[PDB]
Symmetry: D2
Subunit: 116 residues, 4 copies
């Protein structure tokens, strides 16, 4: 799986379940084109977004719908989403894990990048 | 000054100096309009972005040019920039500090929202 | 595995390998007694520290030897270690993941706690 | 003032007020001696812990009483306290700010070390 997203809730100390994730790829005309999307599972993970064939070099944006997650738990959070923007595969295929650690008024995001 | 940006470098343990920051506001046509911008100071802060009169309710995006910062230090970074997206909400008086803590392959952002 | 430790390097965007970890349990005389220890593997994880039988209720300290890790990579970091202190199992057996995200001058640590 | 402590609340997006902080210094006998302590102010800061004369090289531990803070807000926390352990090193003039960003099941700490 060349691209995986993992989301944790720092308030509950638990995986963040049912978080919507939207992935875009910058097109030739400099617009963000839809690339893939899904929702995190019970372990807070989203697998199967793409394939090694489809995940070509480019600039990608992973949008994590944090505001919807918190609202559904009764919290009015600060951020609309978390938006992770990066160049991928520009030195050959890599495996990317995009992790996010959520609080109502703060988040961190980390990339773990390995060579298959 | 209702909006301040603070940036810290987690590798050197220092304010992040000369970091470009761009602020956008979503217009009624649903595109991002340039709103304010600048470069952080020696203390890692950017003051004077806006005024109370101009900083009306709306959806804002703060774009911190992290990649250029790391490149200047010779450290290979992951992200193109850090992006902070939020709604400003009048609810009594408020001051917003958007803080960012930078590492090459990870960042955290926190909103500190206070009443003077 | 009732207790797992996971360590990531925020500078390289990689698991932190060969990080020493020492776990203590507060004894009746209020001293920290050695409980378990090990080193992280290639995926940045340390499994097999304890068993459900041995991991009784108590106050535990997980010491992560961050300074030794960074020094071996040519970085003189700020902290001696990271020290994670918590009560465990006080409402029945749980599974605990203690994660740490390392930079030379800053770290975060998160607990993910699940009910078997 | 060569040592300051700053604490932020990532759930409320605010300084963390009335947080107890204890500072210890390792003695020649290798035990932790009380050094300074206090409670954070409205701005989430604790100033006046020590002086240049007293803050000599050595190993220090800053203990932030996070559990009591969360309990006061009615939020179940994971950690007993946050612990920051470091060596102070004369290497030209220096000021140390120990920052902590708190969530119930996660915290980050950063050292910001500057020359006035």
């Amino acid at each position: 799986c060349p691209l995986m997203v993992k989301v944790l809730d720092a308030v509950r100390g638990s995986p963040a379940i049912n978080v919507a994730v939207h992935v875009f790829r910058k097109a030739a005309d400099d617009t963000w084109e839809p690339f893939a999307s899904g929702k995190t599972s019970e372990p807070g993970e989203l697998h199967g977004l793409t394939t090694e064939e489809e995940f070509v070099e480019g600039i990608y944006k992973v949008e994590i719908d944090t505001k919807s997650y918190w609202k559904a738990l009764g919290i009015s959070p600060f951020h609309e989403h978390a938006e992770v923007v990066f160049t991928a595969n520009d030195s050959g295929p890599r495996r990317y894990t995009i992790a996010a650690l959520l609080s109502p008024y703060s988040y961190s995001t980390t990339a773990v990048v390995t060579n298959p």
